Write an enzyme that holds these catalytic residues in place. Structure first.
Site, PDB file in Angstrom:
ATOM      1  N   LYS A 350      47.872  41.794  46.203  1.00 54.52           N
ATOM      2  CA  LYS A 350      47.631  41.171  47.696  1.00 54.52           C
ATOM      3  C   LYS A 350      49.021  41.494  48.145  1.00 54.52           C
ATOM      4  O   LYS A 350      49.091  42.061  49.402  1.00 54.52           O
ATOM      5  CB  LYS A 350      47.336  39.560  47.712  1.00 54.52           C
ATOM      6  CG  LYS A 350      45.981  39.327  47.806  1.00 54.52           C
ATOM      7  CD  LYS A 350      45.697  37.818  47.816  1.00 54.52           C
ATOM      8  CE  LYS A 350      44.247  37.396  47.969  1.00 54.52           C
ATOM      9  NZ  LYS A 350      43.461  37.939  48.985  1.00 54.52           N
ATOM     10  N   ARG A 357      44.218  41.389  57.390  1.00 55.43           N
ATOM     11  CA  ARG A 357      42.862  40.837  57.243  1.00 55.43           C
ATOM     12  C   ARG A 357      42.201  41.215  58.481  1.00 55.43           C
ATOM     13  O   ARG A 357      42.498  41.855  59.474  1.00 55.43           O
ATOM     14  CB  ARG A 357      43.149  39.128  57.419  1.00 55.43           C
ATOM     15  CG  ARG A 357      43.710  38.375  56.260  1.00 55.43           C
ATOM     16  CD  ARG A 357      42.576  37.853  55.303  1.00 55.43           C
ATOM     17  NE  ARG A 357      43.127  37.354  54.327  1.00 55.43           N
ATOM     18  CZ  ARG A 357      42.583  36.719  53.227  1.00 55.43           C
ATOM     19  NH1 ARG A 357      41.187  36.555  53.270  1.00 55.43           N
ATOM     20  NH2 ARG A 357      43.040  36.229  52.036  1.00 55.43           N
ATOM     21  N   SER A 399      40.206  40.677  47.210  1.00 50.75           N
ATOM     22  CA  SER A 399      39.806  39.264  47.732  1.00 50.75           C
ATOM     23  C   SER A 399      40.080  38.368  46.522  1.00 50.75           C
ATOM     24  O   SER A 399      39.911  38.694  45.274  1.00 50.75           O
ATOM     25  CB  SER A 399      38.362  39.099  48.003  1.00 50.75           C
ATOM     26  OG  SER A 399      37.767  37.959  48.050  1.00 50.75           O
ATOM     27  N   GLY A 400      40.748  37.209  46.530  1.00 53.83           N
ATOM     28  CA  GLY A 400      41.190  36.110  45.711  1.00 53.83           C
ATOM     29  C   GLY A 400      39.669  35.623  45.096  1.00 53.83           C
ATOM     30  O   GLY A 400      39.479  35.699  44.116  1.00 53.83           O
ATOM     31  N   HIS A 401      38.777  35.306  45.997  1.00 53.97           N
ATOM     32  CA  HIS A 401      37.583  34.951  45.825  1.00 53.97           C
ATOM     33  C   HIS A 401      36.813  35.954  44.857  1.00 53.97           C
ATOM     34  O   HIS A 401      36.426  35.338  43.644  1.00 53.97           O
ATOM     35  CB  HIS A 401      36.714  34.628  46.810  1.00 53.97           C
ATOM     36  CG  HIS A 401      36.599  33.238  47.430  1.00 53.97           C
ATOM     37  ND1 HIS A 401      37.793  32.726  47.950  1.00 53.97           N
ATOM     38  CD2 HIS A 401      35.764  32.258  47.398  1.00 53.97           C
ATOM     39  CE1 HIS A 401      37.300  31.345  48.759  1.00 53.97           C
ATOM     40  NE2 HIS A 401      36.282  31.005  48.141  1.00 53.97           N
ATOM     41  N   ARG A 487      32.778  36.290  51.497  1.00 59.69           N
ATOM     42  CA  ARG A 487      33.996  36.464  52.328  1.00 59.69           C
ATOM     43  C   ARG A 487      33.796  37.786  53.294  1.00 59.69           C
ATOM     44  O   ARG A 487      34.241  37.643  54.440  1.00 59.69           O
ATOM     45  CB  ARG A 487      35.014  36.927  51.396  1.00 59.69           C
ATOM     46  CG  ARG A 487      35.400  36.025  50.106  1.00 59.69           C
ATOM     47  CD  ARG A 487      35.504  34.554  50.651  1.00 59.69           C
ATOM     48  NE  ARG A 487      36.661  34.089  51.028  1.00 59.69           N
ATOM     49  CZ  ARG A 487      37.104  33.032  51.471  1.00 59.69           C
ATOM     50  NH1 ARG A 487      36.032  32.058  51.612  1.00 59.69           N
ATOM     51  NH2 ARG A 487      38.552  32.654  51.737  1.00 59.69           N
ATOM     52  N   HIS A 493      37.213  39.139  54.738  1.00 61.53           N
ATOM     53  CA  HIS A 493      37.677  40.151  54.018  1.00 61.53           C
ATOM     54  C   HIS A 493      36.940  41.480  54.388  1.00 61.53           C
ATOM     55  O   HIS A 493      35.786  41.280  54.784  1.00 61.53           O
ATOM     56  CB  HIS A 493      37.328  39.755  52.383  1.00 61.53           C
ATOM     57  CG  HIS A 493      38.500  39.253  51.936  1.00 61.53           C
ATOM     58  ND1 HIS A 493      39.688  39.489  51.731  1.00 61.53           N
ATOM     59  CD2 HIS A 493      38.673  37.620  51.383  1.00 61.53           C
ATOM     60  CE1 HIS A 493      40.576  38.879  51.068  1.00 61.53           C
ATOM     61  NE2 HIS A 493      40.044  37.677  50.893  1.00 61.53           N
TER      62      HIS A 493
END
Length: 574
Positions: A350, A357, A399-401, A487, A493
């Site tokens: 990231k 974004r 994306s972290g998710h 997201r 995202h």
């Protein structure tokens, strides 16, 4: 200190009769409380780390007392390196007390006030009340633990000993520090979110109503590159995102990503929003964006894994089954360590790329016929508060998710393959679950009409209640997929932040331009057909690399599992 009234959790009461599940539950409680009071270990990557540490400690304490056959303890009692030397039981044989000692010591070390120097600079941002609220949870957990806690037992003391080693070795006190970091504005560059460019925070956390000060939050910009990894055996990298470096020429892909972003992630009432009500549900379901009484994504992933664990346990007895205790101790160690490393590498990438974004990409596009300088997203929900939806204060790619989900669910898949069903390591599984409720949509949590009142139960506070949606999923492959695309629906995202567009969207005769229905809504591939095979190039490295968070997470889980959960070689630590 008035104890914050926490809302009821949607899961069978029987779960907590198992001590492994109980301590996991305690870790999850601290997760949600710390995000309600602004305590330590907030944010996605560090909250994941906390759970990884908790379960690593529980794992070694338990397996030292009840030695496993198919694997070993993470740390060895015979390691010359003191930092990696696991304490010996020397007679202690009460696994229940060993786990309790490990869990309590680890959680206390993690959440109690670091009076020992660390209070200055590092901890100088958390109020005494925050620590007090967390202490309440810790203290009552001792009283609630099934079977009780005996602090005087050799086993309990041994457990504490174990936790001490893991805390000393893996704790990253200043890991989330942003000191010195500042955005470098430009096309594709991450910068402060336009709907929340600056926030006013009290000069003194202990005086919330006193003078405020402007604050521009950048969440853990150095963590990924500096922190110690847990069980990964190498560094993980993703392909350059469209528009950057070796992939700067992927304009068709980028332009279509902009189009898809606007249509699928815009605010509910915008004429350009083509997302369906169900898709809004899918978007909010997986949120857990550090909200009051909710916490971060790692909390939801664990809630789901708890259900999977009980649903697929070998024995009916949740209270007195060593088979179940061992099963859960191992599963959660694998899952939460994978989640921790997923957080590390997703954050590393990231901040390496600093990709902007969607909100900023769409607004700042600059082209009259492509961008929308006034676009609004559905956004990351500010649940149990009167605040407006926002954008997580960190870069978009990946994306972290998506990464967390790839790691967590791929780990679950590798663990249950052969037990729940049979499938190729990289193909759809059959690990189904039902009656799964997200606290983002549970008929209790809400979007308040006034600031949250920590002294009153959420249901006594005026606000718009989130519709209660009870879900059933056919597999971990589906969970992983929906978690990732959620997201996109929220507009936080780009499609490629989740996975390669080619791997999740329906193609057309036009390259990099994907199918949409009659209303302009993006059409996705059927979960049963999805394969994360599309790789891309990197300007700085030779070869093909995964695209998006899902593939990254999958690779992290596989590597960890394949190596049987062993420490990251000290030589390869940053």
């Amino acid at each position: 200190v008035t104890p914050i009234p926490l809302p009821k959790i949607d899961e069978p009461e029987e779960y907590n009769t198992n001590y492994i599940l109980f301590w996991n539950h305690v870790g999850l409680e601290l997760n949600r409380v710390t995000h309600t009071v602004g305590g330590p270990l907030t944010g996605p990557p560090l909250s994941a780390r906390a759970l990884g540490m908790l379960h690593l400690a529980i794992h070694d304490a338990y397996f030292s007392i009840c030695p496993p056959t198919d694997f070993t303890t993470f740390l060895s009692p015979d390691t010359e390196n003191a930092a990696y030397r696991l304490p010996s039981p020397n007679g202690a044989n009460d696994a229940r007390q060993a786990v309790a000692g490990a869990a309590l010591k680890m959680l206390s070390s993690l959440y109690m006030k670091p009076v020992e120097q660390p209070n200055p600079n590092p901890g100088a941002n958390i109020s005494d009340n925050a620590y007090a609220q967390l202490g309440l949870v810790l203290d009552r957990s001792v009283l609630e633990a099934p079977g009780g806690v005996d602090r005087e037992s050799a086993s309990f003391m041994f457990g504490e000993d174990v936790a001490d080693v893991f805390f000393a070795l893996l704790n990253d006190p200043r890991g989330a520090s942003q000191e010195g970091y500042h955005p470098t504005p430009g096309r594709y560059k991450f910068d402060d979110e336009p709907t929340h460019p600056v926030v006013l925070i009290p000069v003194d956390p202990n005086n919330p109503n006193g003078p405020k000060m402007p604050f521009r939050q950048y969440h853990a910009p150095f963590y990924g590159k500096t922190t110690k990894r847990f069980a990964t055996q190498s560094e993980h990298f993703l392909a350059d995102p469209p528009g950057l470096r070796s992939n700067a020429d992927e304009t068709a892909e980028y332009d279509d990503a902009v189009r898809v972003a606007i249509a699928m992630g815009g605010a509910q009432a915008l004429n350009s929003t083509k997302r369906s009500p169900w898709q809004t549900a899918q978007g909010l379901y997986w949120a857990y964006d550090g909200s009051n009484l909710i916490g971060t994504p790692p909390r939801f992933y664990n809630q789901i894994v708890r259900r999977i664990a009980v649903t697929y346990k070998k024995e009916e007895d949740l209270a007195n089954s060593e088979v179940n205790n061992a099963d859960f101790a191992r599963l959660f160690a694998l899952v939460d360590v994978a989640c921790t490393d997923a957080g590390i590498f997703s954050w590393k990438e990231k901040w390496e790329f600093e990709f902007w974004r969607p909100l900023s990409g769409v607004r700042d596009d600059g082209r009259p016929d492509h961008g929308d300088p006034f676009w609004l997203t559905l956004g990351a929900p500010a649940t149990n508060t009167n605040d407006i939806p926002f954008k997580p204060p960190f870069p978009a790619y990946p994306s972290g998710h998506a990464t967390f989900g790839g790691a967590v669910f791929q780990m679950v898949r590798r663990y249950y393959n052969g037990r729940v069903g049979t499938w190729k390591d990289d193909e759809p599984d059959n690990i189904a679950i039902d009656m799964m409720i997200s606290e983002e949509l549970n008929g209790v949590n809400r979007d308040l009409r006034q600031p949250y009142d920590p002294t009153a139960p959420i249901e006594d506070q005026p606000g718009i209640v989130r519709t209660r949606i009870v879900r059933h999923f056919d597999s971990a492959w589906e969970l992983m997929f929906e978690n990732a695309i959620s997201r996109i629906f929220l507009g936080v995202h780009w499609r490629f932040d989740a996975a390669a567009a080619r791997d999740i969207l329906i193609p057309t005769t036009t390259k990099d331009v994907y199918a949409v229905d009659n209303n302009g809504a993006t059409v996705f591939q059927n979960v049963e057909d999805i394969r994360y095979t599309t790789r891309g190039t990197r300007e700085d490295e030779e070869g093909l690399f995964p695209i998006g968070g899902v593939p990254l997470g999958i690779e992290i889980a596989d590597e960890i599992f394949n190596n049987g959960l062993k420490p990251t070689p000290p030589e390869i630590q940053p």
